Write a protein that binds this ligand. Structure first.
Ligand SMILES: [Zn+2]
Ligand SMILES: [Zn+2]
Ligand SMILES: [Zn+2]
Ligand SMILES: [Zn+2]
Lengths: 212, 212, 212, 212
């Protein structure tokens, strides 16, 4: 596909919606805010809307390389703060994916340029879980690191001042850690779901334990 | 929709693909890299794949509040550098949208919290184009600011060291500035398309002139 | 000077303080917090303590290339928020300097690498004030840009959510914009001093007017 | 001290230099670049020039809360890249300090606001070294964490793409990790000095071993 194809396809799709789904934009024109924030990877191998059935307007989205929530990344933190404090999303889903190019590059460590600095945060997680990974068969280690990465980003998200403040004041927000692969598109819930500061810690340990 | 609904819908969708599109993941399993990078807004009012017909695996994606390319945002710059230098995408599309909550908040300036710092970059663009906006009817000013924001982010992207280096070395990368609204989902090409350092400047001025 | 010289000089200086100034560390050992935050340039051509006579413990310090307060730089914003909310500094001084290598590189635009992205924020200010600079003799333009840069960083600092919140709640914090050169080390007050949201705007315009 | 005092002291100091040290600015007026980059804490309890005897023009400086080199902090990375690639500094010194308010806040974890996000990077280091710290007497743990923080920031600096590139191309740059306290101002060399990729790893382990 080329650029002229995208523009032309868009024009035809917009016209065909009049017959196929004349109401396609009706919920978007209402003041209903999205209830979900999705933090995923720029690889976007299967779009979040396809994976879940979520409709236009139901999902606020951030994507970056390897779906990180770095403690001091103001881009992601600004998405989160707007979603939690202004849109009042009820769920935040961090979704990783098996085969992620960012996770693979963190492990193989090729000299890729500027991106290698971003990927050092993944190498820190790999270091953190070296003993756990060493108890597992080698062929499962890379996908396990993909899962651990998600769990650590959920943990970071729950430790941000944004989430700590929301939970302290009794706002209902739940964080989830998921992963999928392109072998079937099937979401795996990594079982780290957090609804407050206490469950954040308990279920982080639970998710890691399920891997041990 | 609730969380159990998303998980259950995903499981049913994955199973139904066997009959509907057993080859759905086949291109994803190949080593073909995406040819397009989409930088859009976290509002994600209509997903980029729906707007354009792009299939899974064809698009690398970054989203942040109001689709900014801030000169010093390492999150977006890391997506861009990986896309340009490692994946060798041929097109980068920055897409804004009429009615964007981030653009509207920049103009109305409510006290929203942390996000207001991010939005100051939009207020700088609004200031930059005050005289242009003053020559236009008031009712068209907010959507014109949405377009100017896209054009300025294209300009910032082309001035990044990543893009300047790629163009200097003769890598073929084209940057585009688009917008759409939810009244019809129809993409408007803002006509700032840049294939090198010279067209970046020429077509930036062209796009602004088309508004004057 | 070499590394062994620094270590050896430090050991001799520490010993000599017993006779010269046995009380040198006494105020540092007290709980008195610094009353001033200095945001300056990494060039650090004359140290802030030498310029002003401020003693150890009186100054909290941030330095970066060309003394910027970028709207979305969490490093500088974190220094500011800790200084304002935790240390309760009463004064923030942004100090630029004539001959700054960062300002000069923004104007000459050599291909320096990663730093060029940071310097684009200065090029934006240069663009903003093109008409003002054009009314002045060429030989004064670079130093005038140095001053305008300081004034714009003061303006950015006052527009941060940190400062807006502090002023809204009645905390006494004053922001100042200064510059000096190495021809005499003499500080010039650029006359943009702000004690609240209103004086921020009034004195920003005043400082610019003093240049016109 | 108040603001009028600083301005007045500066004017008197500038005049008195004519008799005391008429050549004070002479090296600054030459094209000699600084040979040292100092990365220190915004606490700046004893200024680096006082600790070492370094003269004006000999030191390029960055300061942030708790002297961090975060993998993805473009402010510090931009200082480093300009210092290494443009100024060609020969030494980078990361200096922490015993009693640092940032390190103490990471351990005590008060609710301080925005700064808590920055401090999570220190809490990650505290977690990393929990077993080491547990083998030591409690009263020495906080200062040991101050030292470990410096060592980890040296390690991060050496793993940045900036430093890896410089060492790969044979540029002579040495990184050092130091600390001091206000009980005597005496620098402690933490013995993690790195001149290439190999010594970075060897001396990181050496410095940690010296603590065990
Ligand atoms: Zn990925
Ligand atoms: Zn938007
Ligand atoms: Zn400077
Ligand atoms: Zn400190």
């Amino acid at each position: 596909k080329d650029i002229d194809t995208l523009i032309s396809n868009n024009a035809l799709w917009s016209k065909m919606l009049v017959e196929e789904d004349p109401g396609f934009f009706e919920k978007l024109a209402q003041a209903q805010k999205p209830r979900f924030l999705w933090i995923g990877c720029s690889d976007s191998r299967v779009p979040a809307e396809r994976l879940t059935g979520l409709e236009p307007g139901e999902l606020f989205v951030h994507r970056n390389v390897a779906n990180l929530v770095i403690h001091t990344d103001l881009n992601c933190l600004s998405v989160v703060q707007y979603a939690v404090d202004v849109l009042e999303v009820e769920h935040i889903i961090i979704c990783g994916h098996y085969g992620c190019g960012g996770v693979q590059a963190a492990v193989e460590n090729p000299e890729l340029g500027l991106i290698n600095n971003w990927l050092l945060h993944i190498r820190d997680i790999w270091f953190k879980h070296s003993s756990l990974l060493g108890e597992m068969p080698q062929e499962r280690r890379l996908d396990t690191l993909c899962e651990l990465n998600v769990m650590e980003q959920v943990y970071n998200l729950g430790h941000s001042t944004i989430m700590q403040s929301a939970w302290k004041r009794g706002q209902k927000v739940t964080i989830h850690g998921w992963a999928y692969g392109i072998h079937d598109g099937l979401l795996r819930d990594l079982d780290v779901t957090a609804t407050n500061r206490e469950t954040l810690e308990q279920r982080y340990r639970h998710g890691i334990s399920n891997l041990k």
